[PDB]
């Protein structure tokens, strides 16, 4: 209907942490994200998550094959964490 472009982004995972480790951060500091290795990365539209999909490398370029679209239940399940 409309021909507007959007900045789609792919998010690897989340991290809830106080700024203790933030100020302690340095080159080489280990950080752990909320998402474990294997689950689909999150496809966000203008920063609004709409999908989940698996990461692939094509022609030495990052890409994501969208596996599924999210549901409100899983959405708010992710949010309330």
């Amino acid at each position: 209907i409309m021909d507007i472009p959007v900045k789609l982004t792919v998010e690897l995972g989340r991290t809830r942490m106080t700024i203790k480790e933030l100020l302690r951060l340095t080159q080489g500091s280990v950080v752990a994200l909320d998402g474990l290795a294997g689950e689909p990365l999150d496809i966000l539209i203008n920063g609004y998550l709409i999908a989940q999909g698996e990461v692939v490398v094509v022609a030495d370029k990052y890409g994501v094959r969208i596996t599924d679209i999210i549901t409100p239940s899983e959405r708010m399940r992710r949010l309330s964490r």
């Binding site: 409309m2 021909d3 507007i4 472009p5 959007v6 539209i45 203008n46 920063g47 609004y48 709409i50 999908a51 022609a59 679209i69 999210i70």
Partner: protein, 290 residues
Amino acid sequence: DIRPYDPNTQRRVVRERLQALEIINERFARQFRMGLFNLLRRSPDITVGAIRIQPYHEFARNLPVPTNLNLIHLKPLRGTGLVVFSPSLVFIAVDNLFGGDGRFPTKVEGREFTHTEQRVINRMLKLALEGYSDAWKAINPLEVEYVRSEMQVKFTNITTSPNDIVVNTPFHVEIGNLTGEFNICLPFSMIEPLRELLVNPPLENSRHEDQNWRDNLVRQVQHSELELVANFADIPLRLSQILKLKPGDVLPIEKPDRIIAHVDGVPVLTSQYGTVNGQYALRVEHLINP
């Protein structure tokens, strides 16, 4: 890498992998094999070669002369495709059909196809087009219609320009000891609308599931904010004026009766400007819609 560019250097690097096209090719190959068995009363085997996404001129330059070039219509896609029947293949088909057991060596010296040879080509082409339509129906239903036949690549000119990128699919057919080839040539513009479907096949339960996916997609993307920028006015200046420009300067401007609201430059609507609640506001008169 610092070399002077020169014309006719069609360094067209458009690399893809059409898995769905490959699967359609295999299904059509099986259908053509069974059709050839039905007609020739002999069992061929058809090997589907690698898909060559190459310029039309490069594709044509390798075509043996003379050869059968059959123009076909890929409805409803705008444009025409080609079926290439090789002289060796037509020779073998006619030999088997008209009493020859094919044990004799194939003698292709280069000559036009006679009316009887034309009829044989017509029959094999009808079988090929039916098999190809059957193969395609699994992914997208298409109607294939024969247009005409030609002996020279210059007779066809399948593309707007010889440098246009085209898809070719070869098939090597063997019957006993007699080998032949036949090709399917479809311009990349034919499949550009369906490029997304042809790249990946990974869907089998999709008749209303596609509609459900699309509805979910739209209802989920409807929650994404945008960047409305309303260009109030447009003044053209020069760089000297910009450099010498100082605060308090007044710049003349034609009176904007209509304000264009755009996002990332993309015009969204036409509106009038005003003030409400103490903030600038736009009352929309017409959205940008072609």
